[PDB]
Design a protein around this ligand. Structure first.
Ligand SMILES: *[C@@H](O)[C@H](O)[C@H](O)[C@H](O)COP(=O)(O)OP(=O)(O)OC[C@H]1O[C@@H](n2cnc3c(N)ncnc32)[C@H](O)[C@@H]1O
Length: 162
């Protein structure tokens, strides 16, 4: 049985070479400022019926891509403990979609680290919940980010796991 693998890329997630992509979504399924701007531009039909509650994920095949809309919590709107539970739940929802649909690779941004961060640095919080959830899969996971300081912190965390 294959073990999951983790890499990090500092690049626009819309250019990924994986079988599926995770959109860091909002619950209403709206295309707004965030990862979803790039996902909507690349796969413009992938948002139809995408609305899904916080802490859940919803998949669509559209425009030749598998898009997984995962709704992390907005840390401005929940307590820290409640958001930590919901963030873990959103990544377990992604992992369940990966395993049940036999998806072999996935491009993933860090949920709740931008628009939904409550103005805090949540890179390691979000990454550690990504590892816990995606460890239940056999997928090749590629984490996407824009920030050089994030890219280093993510690679360091991946390296430790070895
Ligand atoms: C629309 O669905 C929109 O994405 C949502 O309403 C929110 O923006 C989601 O908020 P969240 O905090 O979960 O994530 P977001 O700020 O969108 O992005 C997470 C993380 O990813 C980096 N980022 C943003 N855009 C990209 C692209 N195109 N490629 C790689 N990485 C990207 C941000 O820096 C952010 O930290």
């Amino acid at each position: 049985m294959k073990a999951p693998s983790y890499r990090v890329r500092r690049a626009d997630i819309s250019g990924h070479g994986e079988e599926a992509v995770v959109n860091a979504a909002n619950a209403k399924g709206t295309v707004s400022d965030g990862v979803c701007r790039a996902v909507a531009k690349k796969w413009p039909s992938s948002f139809k019926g995408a609305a899904t509650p916080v802490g859940t994920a919803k998949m669509i095949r559209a425009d030749g891509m598998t898009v997984i809309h995962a709704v992390g919590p907005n840390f401005s709107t929940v307590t820290e403990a409640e958001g930590d539970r919901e963030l873990a739940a959103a990544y377990r929802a992604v992992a369940s979609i990966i395993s049940t649909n036999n998806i072999k690779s996935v491009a993933v941004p860090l949920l709740s680290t931008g628009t939904f961060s409550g103005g805090k640095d949540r890179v390691m919080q979000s990454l550690n919940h990504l590892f816990t959830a995606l460890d239940a899969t056999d997928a090749d996971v590629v984490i996407y980010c824009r920030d050089k300081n994030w890219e280093k912190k993510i690679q360091e965390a991946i390296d430790r796991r070895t």
